Specification:
Distance between the termini: 12 Å
Organism: Homo sapiens
Shape: globular
Number of domains: 4
Number of strands: 18
Strand content: 25-35%
CATH architecture of the largest domain: 2-Layer Sandwich
CATH superfamily of the largest domain: ATPase, nucleotide binding domain
Order of helices and strands: EEEEEEHEHHEEEHEHEHEEEHHEEHHEHH
Structural class: alpha+beta
CATH topology of the largest domain: Nucleotidyltransferase, domain 5
Catalytic activity: ATP + H2O = ADP + phosphate + H(+)
Subcellular location: Cytoplasm; Melanosome; Nucleus, Nucleolus; Cell membrane
Number of helices: 12
Radius of gyration: 21 Å
Family: Belongs to the heat shock protein 70 family.
Largest sheet: 6 strands, mixed
Helix content: 25-40%
GO molecular function, one term: C3HC4-type RING finger domain binding
Bound molecules: magnesium ion
Length: about 375
């Protein structure tokens, strides 16, 4: 039929892939980026989506929307919505039981269902694919967390349809990640698979069973408020403390200063997966004072040591709920950029008494990769 795509509609970042001729291409956006922030901004003149939206967040915090996935398919009264709302700069209001985000856009008050905000993100992902393919894109598989209920899946599906997509199927993220690695193609006895998914804002452990190639979710665990961004935070605080010791100044109430430091820390954290030190080079960070410094891998691990180690606790709980020893796991699959952290891999490999991890697919892209594989199956192109 048409060309069908796989879309990871992520809490922090979204990613789109296409399976063409026995090969997945993860598609770079117009800025060369293979992932796109799940951000939508509203200004005096325009509606911004992705990188453009995330780049003006410090300047426009009340009209720049993110974490829409934390709201999707939920009711305003839901306690989860009530805690989370306390940590966003934009407004969330009640429209007859259902949460809406309220913003100012071109001088008028406007509100949006979370599915409408995620539809804007999905629109961007579709455009991304169409720019690469040079063809109209309609058919898609969109992924969701394994714990999403009927209402959250429907709303996700509805976000796709508002975007003009035909959602072939909603499938689970950890199932998508297993598909990416072709685990459902390893013919033999039933396989027990653990997915260790440490993203930007969420941490998910899932245990799946694959019998004759069919997936069942045995267990889910994790922490909906632990992600790569928590590690970034600790580096930010570390560097704010260091600037204060050095310059006897506190940069904390300058939003742009803290934003620019945070972006540098995000970059440094990635660098630390590959190198044993990272440099921070910020021109005129605060009151005209430059900030050139660095951090070692060791210092980064020390700052985060409790957070890293504690990831093993939901691993133990998922195993318990699935009724399995750790030795019963046949495949371990890494998803999320933070699973590139050597200390995390080491922690998890040691926990599984030396077992090798599925880590060769970019963990930022593994969800979209699997979703693309599955898109191709469903449309008859694989
Ligand atoms: Mg994810």
């Amino acid at each position: 039929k048409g060309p069908a795509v796989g879309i990871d509609l992520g809490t922090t970042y979204s990613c789109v892939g296409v399976f063409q001729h026995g090969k997945v291409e993860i598609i770079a956006n117009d800025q060369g980026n293979r992932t796109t922030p799940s951000y939508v901004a509203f200004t005096d003149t325009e509606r911004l989506i992705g990188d453009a939206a995330k780049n003006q967040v410090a300047m426009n915090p009340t009209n720049t929307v993110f974490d829409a996935k934390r709201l999707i398919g939920r009711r305003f009264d839901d306690a989860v919505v009530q805690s989370d709302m306390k940590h966003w700069p934009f407004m969330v209001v009640n429209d007859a039981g259902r949460p809406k985000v309220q913003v100012e856009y071109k001088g008028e008050t406007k509100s949006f269902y979370p599915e409408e905000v995620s539809s804007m993100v999905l629109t961007k992902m579709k455009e991304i694919a169409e720019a690469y393919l040079g063809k109209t894109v309609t058919n898609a598989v969109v992924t969701v967390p394994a714990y999403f209920n009927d209402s959250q899946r429907q709303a996700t599906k509805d976000a796709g349809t508002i975007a003009g997509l035909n959602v072939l199927r909603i499938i689970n993220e950890p199932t998508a990640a297993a598909i990416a690695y072709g685990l459902d193609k390893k013919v033999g006895a039933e396989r027990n698979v653990l997915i260790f998914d440490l993203g930007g804002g969420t941490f998910d452990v899932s245990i799946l069973t694959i019998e004759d190639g069919i997936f069942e979710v045995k267990s889910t665990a994790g922490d909906t408020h632990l992600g790569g961004e928590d590690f970034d935070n600790r580096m930010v605080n570390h560097f704010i403390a260091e600037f204060k010791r050095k310059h006897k100044k506190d940069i904390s109430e300058n939003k742009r200063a803290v934003r620019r430091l945070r972006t540098a820390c995000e970059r440094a954290k990635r660098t630390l997966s590959s190198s044993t030190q990272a440099s921070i080079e910020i021109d005129s960070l605060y009151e005209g004072i430059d900030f050139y410094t660095s951090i070692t891998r060791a210092r980064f691990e020390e700052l985060n040591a409790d957070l890293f180690r504690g990831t093993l606790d939901p691993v133990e709980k998922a195993l318990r709920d699935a009724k399995l020893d750790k030795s019963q796991i046949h495949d371990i699959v890494l998803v999320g950029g933070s699973t590139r952290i050597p200390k995390i891999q080491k922690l998890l490999q040691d926990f599984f008494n030396g077992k090798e991890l599925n880590k060769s697919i970019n963990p930022d892209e593994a969800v979209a990769y699997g979703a693309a594989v599955q898109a191709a199956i469903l449309s008859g192109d694989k």
